[PDB]
Subunit: 540 residues, 2 copies
Amino acid sequence: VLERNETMYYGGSLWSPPSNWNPFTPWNAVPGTTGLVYETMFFYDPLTGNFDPWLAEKGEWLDSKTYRVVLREGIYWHDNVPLTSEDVRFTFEIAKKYKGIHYSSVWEWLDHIETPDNRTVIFVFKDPRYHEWNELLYTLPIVPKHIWEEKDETTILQSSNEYPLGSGPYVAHSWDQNKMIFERFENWWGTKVMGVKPAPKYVVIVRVLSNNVALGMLMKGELDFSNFMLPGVPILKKVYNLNTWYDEPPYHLSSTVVGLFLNARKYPLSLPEFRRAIAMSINADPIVQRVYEGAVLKADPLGFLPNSVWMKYYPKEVVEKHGFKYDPEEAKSILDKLGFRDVNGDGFRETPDGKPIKLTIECPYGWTDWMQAIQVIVDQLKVVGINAEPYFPDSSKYYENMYKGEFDIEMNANGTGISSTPWTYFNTIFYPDALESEFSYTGNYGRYQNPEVESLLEELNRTPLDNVEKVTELCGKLGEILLKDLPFIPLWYGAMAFITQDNVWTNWPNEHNPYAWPCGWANWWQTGALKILFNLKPAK
Amino acid sequence: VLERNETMYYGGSLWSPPSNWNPFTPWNAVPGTTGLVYETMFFYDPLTGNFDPWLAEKGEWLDSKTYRVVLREGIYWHDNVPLTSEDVRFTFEIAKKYKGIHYSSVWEWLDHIETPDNRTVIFVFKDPRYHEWNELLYTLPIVPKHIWEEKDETTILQSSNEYPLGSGPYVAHSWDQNKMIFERFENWWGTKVMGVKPAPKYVVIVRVLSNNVALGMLMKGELDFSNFMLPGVPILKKVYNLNTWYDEPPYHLSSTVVGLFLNARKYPLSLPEFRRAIAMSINADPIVQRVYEGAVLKADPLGFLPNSVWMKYYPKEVVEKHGFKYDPEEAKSILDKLGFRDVNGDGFRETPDGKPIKLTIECPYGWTDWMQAIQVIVDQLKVVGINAEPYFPDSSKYYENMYKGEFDIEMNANGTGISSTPWTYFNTIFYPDALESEFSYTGNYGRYQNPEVESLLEELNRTPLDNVEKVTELCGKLGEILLKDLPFIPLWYGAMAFITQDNVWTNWPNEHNPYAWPCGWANWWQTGALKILFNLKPAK
Ligand SMILES: [Ca+2]
Ligand SMILES: [Ca+2]
């Protein structure tokens, strides 16, 4: 039995029985496996762009092609084996041996790794990609060489790895079909060296079947920390003492960019002015107000996330000059000029050669907020004379359609999540290799082609993040293309759903004390959720 | 352990640790003690006014002064002692011996009781009060003579009576600080004779500390049957699969009349035209809409409950002619004519002799919906130039003020609950003996005096319920006085809060199948809640 006052119950990201704790599949491993058991070189703060030293005491580019990490002194795995530079080197080098590992592509542009002593890691690059490197610094857990160096490919990639041997502030304790239990590791090196300690003796990852159960647990005070997407936030706050990030709308931080990919290879969506007309016919205000009850923020024309480091590089002048707005009369005028006119008196525009047009707009069946949003968009397109109809395939067919580019208009937030660089956002929109791939998992799902975006994406990746002027300029050049050709239409930002209650734990982050990104998804505890554990205080 | 699929969890009426099961204090005994363990002569249906035979096979007035009950054949207590006419006779006669029993006043107008055989009970009356008698028929549990006939006064009135010896479909099983557990009595006489059987093997009365916990239990599917006063009903139904009586507003049935008593002995509230002006300045629409989100119904001028048998006797012509309405301009005109004018330029009316007026409007602190309603009324009175201020004493002082008549304006629903006769409503308003009592628990808390209401109340009580024409006429004469002199101002009807969920039990009553009043309060299970148990079906 777990004493309630020393246990912190989390929910929102565990949707199957606990069954994997493998650090090499950190998004499939039970949430907290990385973060609580396995540690990363740096903490990252999506709210500010600040990196903070974790396993690394410091990291820096010694020159344009050389990055040095110096580990803190006195790190050790849970079995008291010291954690050294050779564990970091192994963590990277094992992915050259087994390229099925998800970050194996780093060896396309990393040359080798030197370790002059037990604390120093020197990365020597063939082709330093600064923006991809920044993502690796906080997303890759460091694994123990003495545990894994003899394992073969299938063990490394597929073993469940029960009771994971890590270095972090918790160990795996127990689990069943509906919860994972972590126990605080009292001899954690981090308390001796960094002086911090997570407040809860036990962290429980709770799995529920429905939002009814999750909201009920919060109401009963059985859940402390929820990332569940729970509708009805205003009345919950107003009457039931549930807390969100913001006191008033939008209530939650923004974490993804929701928009429309268009099939750039299917006439007439292959015409940029037709896509422009679609964008200008849409008004996201009723979606934000009616569907989401003001619990999301409308997107700017470029779709840069607020409360993110992307705003540091925001191309203001480019957006003001080239950004689109809701303007259905201008959309009709663009379509008239394009030659798309009603020729048969049904109120819908035909092609220049008189053929019917009826476009599908799709999202998975059962994503009921997105379904409502799609119907709102369908009716707004009908206003300007563009016939459209909702299409709700099941989840698997929706993703199959996405990867293959087999749709007309598709609502999408796949790869537009918050990150340490707007490069991830522009890459998701423009992903040039989609044009030569039957399946495109990374982006550009509508197969938009442009002769300049590929070179701008590469130049952006190879621009150091601290060259703020140049990164902003490149975001402006990419943003200009996005806004002129609209292969993707940003509409609103998905919420970082974060609801707490204070009956057992207090001092949660919020707008008045925004000290940590509140995300308990798998492989996101190093972006704020563990820092939350450091700062929670017992309730009265 | 209780198998969930054979257990029905109820909540809403248990607000202290289970500790009393005494039938002689049936509103203090744990809810279900009467109804599930102790039975009554008749079921009563507040929705229709229908009595249905329970212990009695039939009851009828043989003449104007003689009422006969014939018990069903084959009734027995749980210890197999037969339940006979002598148990009914004892149930009444013990209250003549010990007049501290709550229904002892019946012997002021009942002469004696004859039992010519083991099934027949003959009540011979000195002064048959038909409307009070109808209330007794379903509110008094029948108790076993062989158990209680030797007990003394303090045992009868104060003993906790653990494991109560009854005759009904359940026995007391177990309990703790937070729940009472009833177990179905398989050898219940009612299944053999009436052919019915309650569906749940176990009925649990759940105690919770807060509405948060109660709503959380419904969401989690841990509560089946809730009478909790839970705000936020529209969004619950819309998004969280919780069911109410009505699909649309007002969602709940109406169970009480909420209004304002005025101190008929304190100038200027002692003036009927001043009370009239107050009534006409109030608009309950914002209360119904803003405060209650349409989850209550506005009252007609007379305040007769819908979904009640009172409507059978509704004095339509009297109300149309004499009823008040929201009309602040006419209220100002009444006050101008009364001589109540602003003489010092502060916008508030003074007395005819120029003295200030500032009236308190009060309800208990913490009844937050009533507090909001009072502030709405305060501001509406200021509109017509009547200075008023909210007053929120604690619960005990509010009831102390009520019984003593020590208030100006008081919001009140004490004695206006649904019943088998509008006599209970008119008695609560007009209760003539309040004028000669320091404490008045029954009604007329503002000490209104009228030389004709006492004789009309008595004549109404002594009019058989089936004389529909005469009862309606008397309701019209009492309603005319109520509407002319407004000692009490009806505003809206309190809800019979009733929320269910269908994960374990189905076939609940609702507007499409209104077969039972859904009230689990102590001593109300014989008005519908037990009938609900008869008809529940297991979920899929
Ligand atoms: Ca047409
Ligand atoms: Ca004045």
